[PDB]
Amino acid sequence: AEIYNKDGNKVDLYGKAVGLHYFSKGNGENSYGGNGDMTYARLGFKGETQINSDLTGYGQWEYNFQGNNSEGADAQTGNKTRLAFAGLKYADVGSFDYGRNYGVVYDALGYTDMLPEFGGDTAYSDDFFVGRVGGVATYRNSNFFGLVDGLNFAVQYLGKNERDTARRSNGDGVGGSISYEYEGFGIVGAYGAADRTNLQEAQPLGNGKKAEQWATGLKYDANNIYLAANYGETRNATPITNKFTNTSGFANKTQDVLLVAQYQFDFGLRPSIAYTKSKAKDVEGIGDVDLVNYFEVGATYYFNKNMSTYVDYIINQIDSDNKLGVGSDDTVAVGIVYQF
Amino acid sequence: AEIYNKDGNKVDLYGKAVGLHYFSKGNGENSYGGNGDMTYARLGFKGETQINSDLTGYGQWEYNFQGNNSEGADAQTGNKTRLAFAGLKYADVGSFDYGRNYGVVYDALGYTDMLPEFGGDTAYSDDFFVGRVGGVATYRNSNFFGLVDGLNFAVQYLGKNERDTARRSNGDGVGGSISYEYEGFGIVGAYGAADRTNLQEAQPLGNGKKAEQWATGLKYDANNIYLAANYGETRNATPITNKFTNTSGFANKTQDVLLVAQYQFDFGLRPSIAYTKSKAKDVEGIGDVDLVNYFEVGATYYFNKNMSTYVDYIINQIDSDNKLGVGSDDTVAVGIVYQF
Amino acid sequence: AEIYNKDGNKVDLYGKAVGLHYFSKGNGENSYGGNGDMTYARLGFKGETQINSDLTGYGQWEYNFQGNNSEGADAQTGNKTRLAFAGLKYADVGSFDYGRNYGVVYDALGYTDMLPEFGGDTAYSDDFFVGRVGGVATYRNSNFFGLVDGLNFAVQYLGKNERDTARRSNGDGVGGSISYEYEGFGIVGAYGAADRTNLQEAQPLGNGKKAEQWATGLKYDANNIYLAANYGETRNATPITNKFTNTSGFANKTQDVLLVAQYQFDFGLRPSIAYTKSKAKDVEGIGDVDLVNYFEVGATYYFNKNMSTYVDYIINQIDSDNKLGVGSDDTVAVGIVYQF
């Protein structure tokens, strides 16, 4: 809820407070979700300030404090900055902006990502055009420039990023996406591509110079029915591992699915049903491994706009068998969740 | 300040600004406080949303950014999360909530924590049940389901928390507290007990399958006079070191008292007097030591609901010839502090 | 924006969202600024309770989150608290604070510190009196005790400060500043000094017992016309490297000049001309070398008070022979800034 609003400005402070606990055989260290205390928080700020009838200045910055760390050594673990950027909206010319934000592929993935906690597997962090990424930028368009209603696209070039490290960096890119909601129904596509950096293709798991995430989906957000599914392949991006040869970096080829359905019940029950299989094909000396397979089952409960709590659980589809090592065990998290 | 209060979910964004500096002898390291700059700040938010008549939902977070650090290598010593939790309160059934909050036995330990900077020595953090600790479920209740004004309770489970460090872990616990307030007068005590996990156990100092901390407090609040002292012992919970042999871990046995007399003047002076004795028994090969011995003189002065400042002072009863080597040296704090 | 206000207490929640990019020849390592993504944000707060007519308590804080980071290894990088302090004002007795705050000398440097992005090259941090230190005790006075208009002074005692980084330390100082602004024009000096900690004497570079930076500046800020120029030197003060030999520490002797002039057109463009020359003297064996040289050209384009953006261009007057290693290159900066 917006908490300053003078002068044709409005700074919205927003955040949450999540008591989360995971549950899985032992430390889980090898079920799909893990296990133990998983409690975090959110504190960020949406700002906007039209500089007049058609133009809009704005920025936003959402950080992440973790609630599970001691008050010593490691109090800084998994503290990050999720989003941060500047922008301008200008009539039906459209919008633009730059800083760390959601690659554009996300535009797709989004549809299937709403489990109460888990799901959203396809889309990693810093995976190039599919996650939240460091300096990228975007143009978004508003019903073909206002000409025809509901169909907005965008497009995005993704800056040089030779960070520390393997699964973190990324050479360059264009990328975009076109998209269309028809009262209730809705259909989306998105694709992108970019240089990898030599730290990359010099990893042991990796044959590419240039890779592509593309991805699509049909959703039906209406009347408390939500139906959404995605299919989406990749090329030299999903990042993988081999706790066995313990080696790392990237999976040449992969296919992706996601299914999800939720019904938003009458007093705020809103259980949820979900599917989801990410196979890598052609892993060097592995043939084919499922980086992730599960049905899901669970629900959020909406005390209102501010509170909820949920129970969410993952019936796990890989098994011990599994070529690279994705832990096999189910994991079920329960958590509670205030938010202003 | 409460900065946002709406559709029945208020949010109070809160903190301070704390110009602090210790003075100890020559160099302090062999004092009980430190020496030089201590300055720090405080950001955090409680919010509570009214689901409705007898259902309030609230959350809360509180971080703390040290101010004494440089803007390079280190500007990170000290920041931590202090607090993140979440939950609900039901007219007369009690509460509940979960995350990183206080273990029960502070309900009692607290009373004696009221010195303007020091005092409150027995409540380490991540000490199981006595300081803030992570992953705790905290059921409270009040006036015995509304039945007996002033008579309060609580129970709580303490998570399996395998961090890396010895001094910072904790197998699992229950524990709680009973408390009763009568026209100035406060009676409390509480008690808990949890496994150590093997890594705790495998410390040179440290003998037991089982830790238990407990404690009690009797006090007088009211009429511009604070009167309160505290007593409690420990089973294998109180962390200690041996700077001589750089030996680390815990103390089979301790016994502690806290003693505060304080008084709030018509013009916003409020001096504050203090004892603080924490003896260890059975530290392997040392036998008995005093972890903490002091009287503390010092006072606070309250420009108003927003400002304050003060000078707190510890008269060290430890001495040089102390078997673990607790610092013998008097230490003297001087604080000024805004705070919304 | 000020978000809160009743009862003497006003608080002011404030920040921005700076989306940045550097452009510098090829790999940026030999430029003045770097090159790539740079997108950071600010979060902070000013607070001030009037405890009466004459007396005022404030506190305030300011932290610098970065956005050029993944959300993994490094999420923590180049992040600080810059400012944290508090204290009291008094009709014309004056004023006072402790915490981490700007040093006296800045008060003159603060006049040339204006480039949309670069400039102010002389005010390192954690450099004794020239930028932000931590543990400083500042006294300010207004309109010479209300007596004399625009004449204000201020002495600052500067903390024992022995950190890790050689070049983040400092023994103790005092210092100040008379500042005199007369209808249109502004003319001010500051100086101070103090000891160096030993890890400081120790570096191969810099011969000193005792440091001192002074500086003055002059300006005409009035009418959509800003010119300032600054000049000043330092004893065993400005922090310098020898990328060749890789050695560290301090420039025996340095000399420093700042030249800015910008103009404020009334649809809101406001172009800036910039120049800056810093030169070490007597650097142990390297003797006379160049610490920063360039002419700068760029402009800021306000949308309103709350938005804006700018480009800043460093035309770099160093060259490749440069005894110390100073990159010789130009850099350019695009920026889009929102701020509330």
Residue A180 and residue A107: Cα distance in Å, rounded? 11
Local structure of A57: helix, strand or coil: strand
Question: What does the H/E/C string look like for chain C?
Answer: CEEEEECCEEEEEEEEEEEEEEEECCCCCCECCCCEECCEEEEEEEEEEECCCCEEEEEEEEEEEECCCCCCCCCCCCCEEEEEEEEEEECCCEEEEEEECECCCHHHHCCCCCCCCCCCCCCCCCECECCECCCEEEEECCCCCCCCCCEECCCEEECCCCCCCHHHCCCCEEEEEEEEEECCEEEEEEEEEEECCHHHHCCCECCCCEEEECEEEEEEECCCEEEEEEEEEEECCCEEECCCCCCEEECCEEEEEEEEEEECCCCCEEEEEEEEEEEEECECCCECCEEEEEEEEEEEECCCCCCCEEEEEEEECCCCCCCCCCCCECEEEEEEEEEC
The count of structural domains within chain C is: 1
* DSSP-derived pairing of the beta strands B253-263 and B225-235: antiparallel
Residue B41 and residue C6: Cβ atoms within 8 Å?
no
Whether residue B128 contacts residue B197, with contact meaning beta carbons closer than 8 Å, is answered with no
Q: Please, is C168 exposed, middle or buried when counting C-beta atoms within 10 Å of its C-beta (0-12, 13-18, 19+)?
A: buried
Closest-CA residue to A17 (of A302, A340, A338, A334): A338
Phi, psi of B106 (to 5 degrees): -105, -15
Local structure of A166: helix, strand or coil: helix
Q: Please, is B91 exposed, middle or buried when counting C-beta atoms within 10 Å of its C-beta (0-12, 13-18, 19+)?
A: exposed
Phi, psi of C166 (to 5 degrees): -15, -80
Residue B8 and residue B58: Cα distance in Å, rounded? 11
Across the interface, of A6, A81, A159, the residue whose CB is closest to C1 is: A6
Both tokens of C21, joined, read 């990019």
CA gyration radius, chain A: 20
Both tokens of C164, joined, read 């890790």
Both tokens of B228, joined, read 């309160």
B/C interface, count of CB pairs below 8 Å? 152
Closest-CA residue to B301 (of B269, B259, B253): B269
Q: Which chains touch B (3 or more CB pairs under 8 A)?
A: A, C
Whether residue C134 contacts residue C126, with contact meaning beta carbons closer than 8 Å, is answered with yes
Residue C18 and residue A55: Cβ atoms within 8 Å?
no
Closest CA in chain A for residue C26: A160
* Terminal Cα distance for chain A, rounded: 7
User: Which of C5, C16, C307 has the most A C-beta neighbours within 10 Å, making it the best mutation to test the interface with A?
Assistant: C307
Distance of CA C56 to the CA centre of its chain: 26
Both tokens of B58, joined, read 């609230």
Whether residue A296 contacts residue A115, with contact meaning beta carbons closer than 8 Å, is answered with yes
Distances (CA, A) of C333 to A60, C297, C301: 21, 11, 14
Which amino acid is present at A111? Answer: Y
Residue B231 C-beta-side C-alpha neighbours within 13 Å: 2
Whether residue A292 contacts residue A273, with contact meaning beta carbons closer than 8 Å, is answered with no
Local structure of B223: helix, strand or coil: coil
Q: Look up the domain containing A5 and give its range.
A: 1-340
Residue A31 and residue A41: Cα distance in Å, rounded? 24
Q: Could you list the beta-strand ranges (E) of A183-286.
A: 185-195, 210-219, 225-235, 239-241, 248-250, 253-263, 269-283
Q: Which stretches within chain B are classed as H helix?
A: 106-109, 143-146, 198-201
Residue B276 and residue B112: Cα distance in Å, rounded? 9
Residue C75 and residue B167: Cα distance in Å, rounded? 26
DSSP state string for B18-63: EE-EEEESTTSTTBSS-SEE--EEEEEEEEEEEEETTEEEEEEEEE
Both tokens of A199, joined, read 């730290």
Q: Residue B7: which residues within 8 A CB-CB, separation 6 or more?
A: A1, A305
Both tokens of C281, joined, read 């003297």
Which amino acid is present at C226? Answer: Y
Shortest Cα distance from B66 to chain C (angstroms)? 8
Whether residue C309 contacts residue C17, with contact meaning beta carbons closer than 8 Å, is answered with no
Which amino acid is present at B279? Answer: K
Residues of chain B contacting residue A306, judged by C-beta atoms under 8 Å apart:
9, 47, 49, 57
Shortest Cα distance from C52 to chain B (angstroms)? 9
Closest-CA residue to B4 (of A14, A127, A336): A14
Tokens 């990023």: give the residue.
A161
Across the interface, of C3, C17, C307, the residue whose CB is closest to A84 is: C17
Region of residue C307 (left: phi > 0; alpha: psi -120 to 50; beta: else): beta
CATH number at residue C120: 2.40.160.10
Distance of CA B200 to the CA centre of its chain: 22
Both tokens of A201, joined, read 């293709």
Closest-CA residue to A192 (of A234, A161, A231): A234
Residue C18 and residue A86: Cβ atoms within 8 Å?
yes
Across the interface, of A18, A67, A71, the residue whose CB is closest to B126 is: A71
CA gyration radius, chain C: 20
Q: Please, is A228 exposed, middle or buried when counting C-beta atoms within 10 Å of its C-beta (0-12, 13-18, 19+)?
A: buried
Whether residue C203 contacts residue C242, with contact meaning beta carbons closer than 8 Å, is answered with no
Both tokens of B245, joined, read 């042999």
Q: In degrees, to the nearest 5, what angle opens at C-alpha B66 toward C-alphas B63 and B69?
A: 150
Phi, psi of B145 (to 5 degrees): 75, 40
Residue C21 and residue A197: Cα distance in Å, rounded? 19
Tokens 């996406």: give the residue.
A177
Residue B211 C-beta-side C-alpha neighbours within 13 Å: 31
Residue A306 and residue B57: Cβ atoms within 8 Å?
yes
Local structure of B200: helix, strand or coil: helix
Which amino acid is present at A66? Answer: Q
DSSP state string for B69-111: S-SSTTTTTT-EEEEEEEEEEETTTB--EEEE-B-TTHHHHGG
Residue B241 and residue B249: Cα distance in Å, rounded? 7
Q: How many CB atoms lie within 10 A of CB C184?
A: 11
Q: Residue B79: which residues within 8 A CB-CB, separation 6 or more?
A: A75, A76, B63, B64, B65, B66
Residues of chain A contacting residue B81, judged by C-beta atoms under 8 Å apart:
41, 65-67, 69, 71, 75
Residue B171 C-beta-side C-alpha neighbours within 13 Å: 16
Phi, psi of A264 (to 5 degrees): -105, 95
Tokens 């309250």: give the residue.
B302
Shortest Cα distance from A1 to chain C (angstroms)? 13
Residue A215 and residue A232: Cα distance in Å, rounded? 4
What does the CA dihedral C156, C157, C160, C165 come to, rounded to 10 degrees?
10
The method recorded for this entry reads X-ray
Q: How many CB atoms lie within 10 A of CB B43?
A: 20
Residues of chain B contacting residue C125, judged by C-beta atoms under 8 Å apart:
70-72
Tokens 């700007």: give the residue.
C102
Residue B163 and residue A72: Cα distance in Å, rounded? 10
Local structure of B144: helix, strand or coil: helix
